[PDB]
C-alpha cells in the first residue's frame, strides 16, 4: 500500500514484510517482537500499541512478568534489535571459543522472552545487563555496545517510569 514502507523497520531489508495497521513501519515475521501474527484483526506493531498505554527500580524488577510487563520487555528488546549494534551481540560472543559470569546473547534472551521463560521483569533485565558485563571483561573493541547499553537503560527507565 501507499501508506507503508518497503524495508523492514528493524533490519532495513525486503522479502516477506507485514504492515502495521496504523503507522508506516513494516516487519519480517520474527524481526518484530513478539513475532507477527497476520491472523490478528487487525495487526498493530508494538510501538503504536505501547504509544496507547497508560517509582523505584527495585519495585519494577520484583514484578511478576504478567501480560503488560511481558509486552514492555518485548517493546524494550525490539528497540535493542533496532539499534545497529544489535548485530554484534545477537549470536554467541566472538570471545566464547577462545582458550565472565554466563555466556549471553540477544537471540538467547529473545527465545526465552518469546517462550515466557522469565517469571519476573528482573530475569529479562539481568540477562540484558550480563551481555555488557561479559563484554567489558575481554580482549580491543572501542565503544562497541556503549550505544546499545545506553539506549536500553534510557528506554527501561522511560517504559516503567523509574525515578528522575
Amino acid at each position, epitope marked *: *500500500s501507499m501508506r507503508n514502507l518497503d524495508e523492514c523497520e528493524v533490519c532495513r531489508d525486503g522479502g516477506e514484510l507485514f504492515c502495521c*495497521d*496504523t503507522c508506516s513501519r513494516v516487519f519480517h515475521e520474527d524481526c518484530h517482537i513478539p513475532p507477527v501474527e497476520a*491472523e*490478528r*484483526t*487487525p495487526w*498493530n506493531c508494538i510501538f*503504536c*500499541r*505501547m*504509544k*496507547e*498505554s*497508560p517509582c523505584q527500580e527495585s519495585e519494577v524488577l520484583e514484578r511478576q512478568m*504478567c*501480560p*503488560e510487563e511481558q*509486552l514492555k520487555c518485548e517493546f524494550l528488546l525490539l528497540k535493542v534489535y533496532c539499534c545497529s549494534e544489535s548485530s554484534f551481540f545477537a549470536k554467541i560472543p566472538y570471545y566464547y571459543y577462545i582458550r565472565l559470569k554466563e555466556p549471553m546473547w540477544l537471540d538467547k534472551i529473545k527465545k526465552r522472552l518469546n517462550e515466557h521463560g522469565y517469571p519476573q521483569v528482573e530475569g529479562f533485565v539481568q540477562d540484558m545487563r550480563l551481555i555488557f558485563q561479559n563484554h567489558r571483561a575481554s580482549y580491543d573493541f572501542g565503544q562497541m555496545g556503549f550505544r546499545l547499553e545506553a539506549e536500553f537503560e534510557k528506554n527501561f527507565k522511560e517504559v516503567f517510569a523509574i525515578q528522575e
Partner: single-chain antibody, 226 residues
Framework: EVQLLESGGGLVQPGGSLRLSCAASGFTFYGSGMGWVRQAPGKGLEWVSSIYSGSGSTYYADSVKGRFTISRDNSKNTLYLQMNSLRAEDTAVYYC????????????WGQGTLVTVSSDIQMTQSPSSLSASVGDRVTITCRASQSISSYLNWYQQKPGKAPKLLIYAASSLQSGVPSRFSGSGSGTDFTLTISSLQPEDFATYYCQQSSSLFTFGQGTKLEIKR
C-alpha cells in the same frame, strides 16, 4: 471529557435501510479503534462491527456480513454504521464503543441508540446466574472455544446503563475500578473474582475475547440472597 453520542436510530420497515452515526470528542479519534455493540431489550451484548485504520481494516459479525457497512470520517470525529436489509433480529440498542489498541479492549461507551423494525470463537460463562451476600467471595468463569492468549476483557453492566470495563489483558484492573475486582487465566479458562462483595456489585457481568474479532459471554447476573 471523553464523550461518544450516537444518533440515527429509529423505526424502519423490514428490508429497509438506516444509518447510525456516533460523534466522538475528548480523545485523538484516528489513534483509536471504534466498534458497534448491540443489545436486544433484556438480552446480552453482541459485537456487530469494528473499524480500525480506514476501510481496509473493517470487521463484521457473520450475522450482519454483506448487510451492514461500517465507516469513519476522522475529519469530523464521526463513526457510521450503514444498516441494510433489516430483520427483527436487528431490533436492539446500538452502542458506539472505543477499542484501545494497547490490548484491544472497549474502555469508552456511548449511551446507545435504539433501532426498531416491524467458525468464530465461542465464550461460555459459568454460572448463568448467581445469588450471593454482601461480604461473600464471588468467582465467575469464562471458557473459550480455542486459545485467546491474554486477550480477555471483563465488563459490568447495571440496569439502564452502558457496559463498563473492569479488567483488560486477562488480569489488568482498568483505572478507577476497585481493588476487590481481579481477573486471572490465559489460553481457554479465565476467572473474574470479587474478594468482598459490595451492594453496588449486584449487576450483570460479561467476559469478551479480543484475540480474533470480539465475542461476548452469555452474561452472569449476580443477585442478592434472601
Amino acid at each position: 471529557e471523553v464523550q461518544l453520542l450516537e444518533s440515527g436510530g429509529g423505526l424502519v420497515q423490514p428490508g429497509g435501510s438506516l444509518r447510525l452515526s456516533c460523534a466522538a470528542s475528548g480523545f485523538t479519534f484516528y489513534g483509536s479503534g471504534m466498534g458497534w455493540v448491540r443489545q436486544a431489550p433484556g438480552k446480552g451484548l453482541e459485537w456487530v462491527s469494528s473499524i480500525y485504520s480506514g476501510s481496509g481494516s473493517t470487521y463484521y459479525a457473520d450475522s450482519v456480513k454483506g448487510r451492514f457497512t461500517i465507516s469513519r470520517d476522522n475529519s469530523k470525529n464521526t463513526l457510521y454504521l450503514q444498516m441494510n436489509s433489516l430483520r427483527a433480529e436487528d431490533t436492539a440498542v446500538y452502542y458506539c464503543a472505543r477499542t484501545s489498541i494497547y490490548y484491544y479492549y472497549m474502555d469508552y461507551w456511548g449511551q446507545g441508540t435504539l433501532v426498531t423494525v416491524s467458525s468464530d470463537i465461542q465464550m461460555t460463562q459459568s454460572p448463568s446466574s448467581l445469588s450471593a451476600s454482601v461480604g461473600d467471595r464471588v468467582t465467575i468463569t469464562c471458557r473459550a472455544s480455542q486459545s485467546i492468549s491474554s486477550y480477555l476483557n471483563w465488563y459490568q453492566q447495571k440496569p439502564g446503563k452502558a457496559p463498563k470495563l473492569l479488567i483488560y489483558a486477562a488480569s489488568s484492573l482498568q483505572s478507577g475500578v476497585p481493588s476487590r475486582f481481579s481477573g486471572s487465566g490465559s489460553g481457554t479458562d479465565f476467572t473474574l473474582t470479587i474478594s468482598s462483595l459490595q451492594p453496588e456489585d449486584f449487576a450483570t457481568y460479561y467476559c469478551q475475547q479480543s484475540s480474533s474479532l470480539f465475542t461476548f459471554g452469555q452474561g452472569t447476573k449476580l443477585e442478592i440472597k434472601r
